[PDB]
């Protein structure tokens, strides 16, 4: 009741200090005789508060007092605490934090003083509470278990129960997947790191990861459903896959096939948002940019002062004695509205409203932002933002929204009948033009980064991984597509390593890989297509790969060289008269020549001259003279 | 292998052609049931949309919605 | 576009358990429910009111640094939704709507309800 | 230093009277431009009334010339509108300046100067808003005359359009 | 504390508090020479710069002037030109501690005047 | 209106030059009180050196009289600080007036006056920041003398404390 709760929800330092004083005295008196009941009481207390419709889940009660309780709990010793309550709090707390991250608000408005890091941000208010809960979970999972696994001891750990709990693991991993590159994401990442360290066996840690990677959103199945990856989660997986034993175990459980299957599938399931030659053509036909000046601002109240002065790009001087725009509230009016119509839809990212700094009493107490992508049907973005006492109103959309109109509903000031505003900015982007200024989460590259790490991290195992990765259908076609795509969080050289190591692990895929690079790279409504790329296009990456295939010494070398020469003859023959044959890359032809030259000077172990028959030579002469 | 910027124009051209013909082309004349289901799942499906990450970005989502609305309006 | 009885039931069930229902989601839900009452399916309004999940949904909606309010637009949508329920039920069976209103107000008023804890818009 | 602060106060008095001079000048220029705008407004109003009297073929050799004159009136009125709106922007700039000057006065204890400036601002703003009231009446009367012009045109041309349909039906059909 | 308030247009806050980056609350303890029946507490923020007005105020009252007791949860005060805290039940108070929360959008808290209105047990001030 | 805009431009040049002269006088008063503050700062610095030279138990008619003079110096410095802060608030109001005048000059087209305004604003602000640097220099040296006084004072304090502990240990223990 105490922690569950116009007054502020806080209780103030004195009441909050009393609760800490109360809890501290309990702890001291119980320390020398029976501290386990106090910790159980705290965890039972925290569990009750965290359960659905509990204080934490509903955001009720004194936040300062709740955080102080959470801060107090983090300093307690949880030895000899029953495993039932620990699992209850971890389940409840992880569910709560997963709920918090999934239920994050659509808009974001902080004061200029606030400089905290958002929950969805790694490797750097309710956020502090959620982070405080996550710190608690980390402390609990590190507790050694007693002999019978019913109480904390004082070499198994609660992590095993957590890892053995599929629902708990799904929540944590799915929760971390909604984070992006100390905040809540750090807490999830630290907990997951803690789970891996304390896992009894590498299989215990890998199974939840593999289970998550084997399903889609909320454990769904389906052909094109794949799990959400993020840089923190991907970074964690790589740390999990850091050892040879873990990599061997990952391979043994179908992990390599899984990630390779996911890459093919996920690559089918994504459209490249990177700008392409269509965007360039728009540019040829002639950080965010303020579109408010271009818009027209109106109000539903017939008696409102015209607010166009608010849209002007140049704000008035901060000590101007008269608000650029003022609204006189009727005694029964709580909200005034300002509709900004833009000439065309823009990707709105922020809305800045400047209250009259000289008379802050007329600043609206709260602002309700509605956004209309079509500019006709307004839809509230979120609940009104409390704005009283703000010299500057910065409303950041966490997810940029297409908006052709923005309706600001400003609440009557607490202590004034007039609302005074200086400027309104609508910051954003256009579809194209000069004003159009986590890749792992939005592309399939995360799977390739996982695949590259598996192939390269431990050389002695490389072969096995390639053998497990080569069979999957359309893997090479997809990797070629990622090779020829604009940088999307993975540098081309790493993609080259994957393609080279896959193509070299057996002759059959080398012929397929050569054909993909030179002849036909397309996939062999759910099937992968990879129709987007021209056949036979050459780059620094493709040229290097072809050279690496040609000059690598192994049993298949001969066959690969044959294929190259075959493509040459085919190309020449086609020239004398499938796209790769019609438009042979000059760079690749020189690459074939360099392969031949360097093979001659390397003293290869196959009969290179026998492959160079006179008929092929005559073909080249006829071609060049043509 | 394809790009969202081209998708925007593909959607625009699709809608414009649909609304340009004398007997305006109806969405049923363009797609069959699996195709339309996939089309809508691009907008609303969780295999193509992951919350803050939408298939083709906000602009692609808006263009697809606008194309669907334009085709429907031509029908209606 | 007309949804069927199974579709509406699934929608209400999801809303009853949907944990992350933010305000824009709620405005969408209320506007959609308004339009659904206008659908020709037993009238659709009767199906909605007869479903306990509808009460669960409105209780969650009314149970809730942002102001606790929802603003005129979200509130106006909720009023519009209730008005449509009332209009469609007037000529056939208003007692269930009135019973629904009192059941709704009762749940909100019971101990740990919205009114007692002073939560929600 | 009382002497220092007194010289300061008189300096601010100088700022206040020079800002009152500029504000007066900008008010006078604004009032002139508002007046000429209002002139073009009432002119265009009467011109629309005449054109409404010339609606239909009754005197095309007059309708087209009153139309051309109306075009020139529109151009003059609108260019004067933009001109006097830039002028009024400058006027509000001067008002803000004079208010900031009263702010400096109050700060330095030149309260007499501050009050003089404030009363000057009130006088100027009232007189401005009087010429603005005249301009808004003129604009209302132009709007009403244009509305009646639109009614009469749409009525007469609507009847003539119905007659044109009937006349097309009189023959060959 | 001065009985005569500063000019309503006083351009500089009579009193200002600079918040350290880790400080959320500032406190002001008014000790009275003798206990009085406190009925209202008026706080006048600097009207020229309302950004320095406290975001909320937690009132503690001590009848003996030693053991402070919060009257209620902090009152939200951001955006108020005048802070009037009326005690529904008059309380004997020999000391009043006002805990003012850092403003939402300012690192300095500016106050003009604090009034402690009430009655004495006897004397001229002893005025269902 | 040729005459109207020409005269209005000239009037904005008057506002610009008046506001420039005002801001100059305000900078001069500000500099004056900043200078008096600086003087008091150097005085307090020397007085800190004196008190440091009188640290350890000695004639209070020297040590605590130097301390009393230090209190007088502090009062002088603080009162002048408050007065120059009032002056500086008015000075920032003056800067604001000059900036608003430059904007009025643009809106009228007296860009030559706007430029001269900006030039004067920059020159004044530069010199003001320069005397602010002088103030900061004096304050930094005052802080240095405070640090020296702290080192010496604390040294004596701790020495005496140690000796007092030893003298308490001489008895009953």
From Swiss-Prot, chains D, F:
**Segments of this protein annotated with the region Disordered:** 151-173
Disulfide links within the chain: none
Segments forming a coiled coil: none
Identify the domain of life. Eukaryota
What is this protein's record name? Diablo IAP-binding mitochondrial protein, cleaved form
Species assigned in the record: Homo sapiens
Swiss-Prot record, chain E:
Q: Which domain of life is it from?
A: Eukaryota
Q: How is it modified after translation?
A: Ubiquitinated; mediated by RNF41 E3 ligase and leads to proteasomal degradation, impairing inhibition of apoptosis. Deubiquitinated by USP8/UBPY. Autoubiquitinated; mediated by E1 ubiquitin activating enzyme UBA6.
**Where is it localised?**
Golgi apparatus, trans-Golgi network membrane; Endosome; Cytoplasm, Cytoskeleton, Spindle pole; Cytoplasm, Cytoskeleton, Microtubule organizing center, Centrosome
The annotated region (HRRAR loop) lies at 7-11
**Tissue and organ expression note:** Expressed in brain cancer cells.
Report quaternary structure and partners.
Homodimer; antiparallel. Interacts with RNF41. Interacts with DIABLO/SMAC, likely with higher affinity to SMAC dimer than SMAC monomer; this interaction blocks the substrate-binding site and inhibits the caspase inhibition activity of BIRC6. Interacts with KIF23/MKLP1, USP8/UBPY, BIRC5/survivin, MAP2K1/MEK1, RAB8A/RAB8, RAB11A/RAB11, PLK1, EXOC3/SEC6 and EXOC4/SEC8.
Write out the similarity annotation: Belongs to the BIRC6 family.
General function of this protein: Anti-apoptotic protein known as inhibitor of apoptosis (IAP) which can regulate cell death by controlling caspases and by acting as an E3 ubiquitin-protein ligase. Unlike most IAPs, does not contain a RING domain and it is not a RING-type E3 ligase. Instead acts as a dual E2/E3 enzyme that combines ubiquitin conjugating (E2) and ubiquitin ligase (E3) activities in a single polypeptide. Ubiquitination is mediated by a non-canonical E1 ubiquitin activating enzyme UBA6.
Q: What is known of its domains?
A: The BIR domain is essential for its anti-apoptotic function and is important for binding to DIABLO/SMAC and caspases.
Protein's name in the database: Dual E2 ubiquitin-conjugating enzyme/E3 ubiquitin-protein ligase BIRC6
Species source reads Homo sapiens
Q: What is the lineage of its organism?
A: Eukaryota, Metazoa, Chordata, Craniata, Vertebrata
| First-to-last residue of the parent protein present | 3183 to 3321 of 4857
């Amino acid at each position: 009741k105490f922690l569950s709760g116009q007054h502020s929800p806080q209780v103030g330092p004195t009441a909050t200090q009393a609760m800490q004083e109360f809890l501290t005295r309990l702890q001291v008196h119980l320390s020398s005789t029976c501290p386990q009941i106090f910790s159980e009481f705290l965890l039972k207390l925290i569990h009750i508060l965290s359960t659905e419709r509990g204080a934490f889940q509903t955001g009720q009660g004194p936040l300062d007092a709740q955080v102080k309780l959470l801060e107090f709990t983090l300093e307690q010793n949880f030895e000899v605490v029953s495993v039932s309550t620990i699992s209850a709090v971890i389940e409840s707390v992880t569910f709560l934090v997963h709920h918090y991250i999934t239920c994050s608000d659509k808009v974001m408005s902080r004061s200029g003083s606030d400089s905290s890091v958002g929950a969805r941000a790694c490797f750097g208010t309710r956020d502090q509470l959620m982070f405080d809960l996550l710190k608690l979970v980390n402390i609990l999972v590190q507790l050694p278990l007693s002999g019978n696994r019913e109480y904390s001891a004082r070499p198994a750990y609660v992590a095993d129960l957590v890892l053995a709990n599929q629902q708990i693991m799904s929540q944590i991993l799915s929760a971390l997947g909604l984070c992006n590159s100390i905040s809540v994401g750090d807490g999830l990442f630290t907990i997951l790191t803690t789970l891996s360290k304390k896992a009894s066996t590498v299989h215990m840690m890998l199974q939840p990861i593999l289970t998550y990677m084997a399903c889609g959103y909320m454990g769904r199945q389906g052909s094109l459903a794949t799990c959400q990856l993020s840089e923190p989660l991907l970074w964690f997986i790589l740390r999990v896959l850091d050892t040879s034993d873990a990599l061997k175990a990952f391979h043994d459980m179908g992990g390599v096939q899984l990630i390779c299957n996911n890459m093919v599938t996920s690559t089918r399931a994504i459209v490249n948002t990177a700008r392409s030659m269509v965007s360039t053509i728009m540019k040829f036909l002639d950080g965010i940019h303020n579109f408010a000046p271009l818009g027209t601002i109106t109000s539903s109240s017939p008696t409102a002062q015209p607010a166009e002065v608010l849209l002007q790009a140049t704000p008035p001087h901060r000590r101007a004695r008269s608000a650029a725009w003022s609204y006189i509230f009727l005694p029964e009016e709580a909200w005034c509205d300002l509709t900004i119509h833009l000439p065309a839809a823009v990707l709105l990212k922020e809305i800045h409203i400047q209250p009259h700094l000289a008379s802050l009493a007329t600043c609206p107490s709260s602002v309700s932002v509605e956004v209309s992508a079509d500019g006709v049907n307004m839809l509230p973005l979120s609940t009104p933002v409390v704005t009283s006492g703000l010299t500057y109103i910065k409303i950041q959309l966490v997810k940029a929204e297409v908006a052709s109109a923005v309706c600001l509903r400003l609440h009557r000031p607490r202590d004034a009948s007039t609302l005074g505003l200086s400027q309104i900015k609508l910051l954003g982007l256009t579809a194209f033009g000069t004003t159009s200024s986590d890749q792992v989460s939005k592309t399939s590259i995360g799977w390739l980064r996982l695949l590259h790490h598996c192939l390269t991290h431990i050389s002695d195992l490389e072969g096995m991984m390639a053998s497990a990765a080569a069979p999957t259908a359309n893997l090479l076609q997809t990797c070629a597509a990622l090779l020829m795509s604009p940088y999307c969080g993975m540098h081309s050289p790493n993609i080259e390593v994957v393609l080279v190591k896959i193509g070299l692990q057996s002759t059959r895929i080398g012929l397929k890989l050569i054909d993909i690079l030179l002849r036909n790279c397309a996939a062999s409504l759910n099937s992968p297509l990879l129709f987007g790329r021209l056949n036979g296009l050459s780059s620094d990456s493709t040229i290097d790969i072809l050279y690496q295939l040609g000059t690598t010494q192994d049993p298949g070398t001969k066959d690969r060289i044959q294929a190259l020469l075959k493509w040459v003859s085919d190309s020449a023959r086609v020239a004398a008269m499938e796209y790769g044959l019609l438009m042979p890359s000059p760079s690749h032809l020189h690459c074939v020549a360099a392969i031949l030259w360097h093979s001659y000077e390397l003293l290869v172990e196959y009969d290179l001259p026998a492959l160079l028959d006179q008929e092929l030579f005559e073909l080249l002469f006829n071609w060049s003279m043509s | 292998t394809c790009h969202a910027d081209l998708l925007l124009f593909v959607c625009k051209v699709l809608a414009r052609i649909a609304n340009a013909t004398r007997p305006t082309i109806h969405l049923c004349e363009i797609v069959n049931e699996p195709q339309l289901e996939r089309l809508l799942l691009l907008l609303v499906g969780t295999d193509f949309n992951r919350g803050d990450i939408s298939w083709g970005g906000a602009w692609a989502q808006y263009s697809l919605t606008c194309m669907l609305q334009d085709i429907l309006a031509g029908e209606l | 576009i007309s949804l069927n009885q199974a579709s509406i039931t699934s929608f209400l069930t999801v809303l009853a358990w949907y944990p992350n229902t933010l305000l824009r989601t709620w405005c969408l839900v209320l506007h959609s429910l308004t339009l659904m009452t206008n659908m020709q399916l037993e009238s659709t309004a009767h199906l909605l009111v007869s479903d306990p999940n509808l009460i669960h949904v409105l209780v969650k909606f009314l149970s809730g640094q942002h102001s606790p309010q929802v603003g005129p637009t979200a509130t106006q949508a909720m009023q519009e939704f209730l008005t449509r329920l009332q209009v469609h039920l007037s000529s056939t069976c208003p007692q269930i709507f009135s019973e629904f209103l009192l059941k709704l107000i009762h749940i909100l008023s019971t101990e740990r309800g919205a009114f007692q804890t002073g939560q929600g818009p | 230093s009382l002497s220092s602060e007194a010289l300061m106060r008189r300096a601010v008095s100088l700022v206040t009277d020079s800002t009152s001079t500029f504000l007066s000048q900008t008010t006078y220029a604004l009032i002139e431009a508002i007046t000429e705008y209002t002139k073009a407004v009432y002119t265009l109003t009467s011109l629309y009334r005449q054109y409404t009297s010339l609606l239909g073929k009754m005197n095309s050799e007059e309708e087209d010339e009153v139309w051309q004159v109306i075009i020139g009136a529109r151009a003059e009125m609108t260019s004067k509108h933009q001109e006097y709106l830039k002028l009024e922007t400058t006027w509000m700039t001067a008002v803000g300046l004079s208010e900031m000057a009263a702010e400096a006065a109050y700060q330095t204890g030149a309260d007499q100067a501050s009050i003089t400036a404030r009363n000057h601002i009130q006088l100027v703003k009232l007189q401005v808003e009087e010429v603005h009231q005249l301009s808004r009446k003129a604009e209302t009367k132009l709007a009403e005359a244009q509305i009646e012009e639109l009614r009469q045109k749409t009525q007469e041309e609507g009847e003539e359009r119905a007659e044109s349909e009937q006349e097309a039906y009189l023959r060959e059909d």
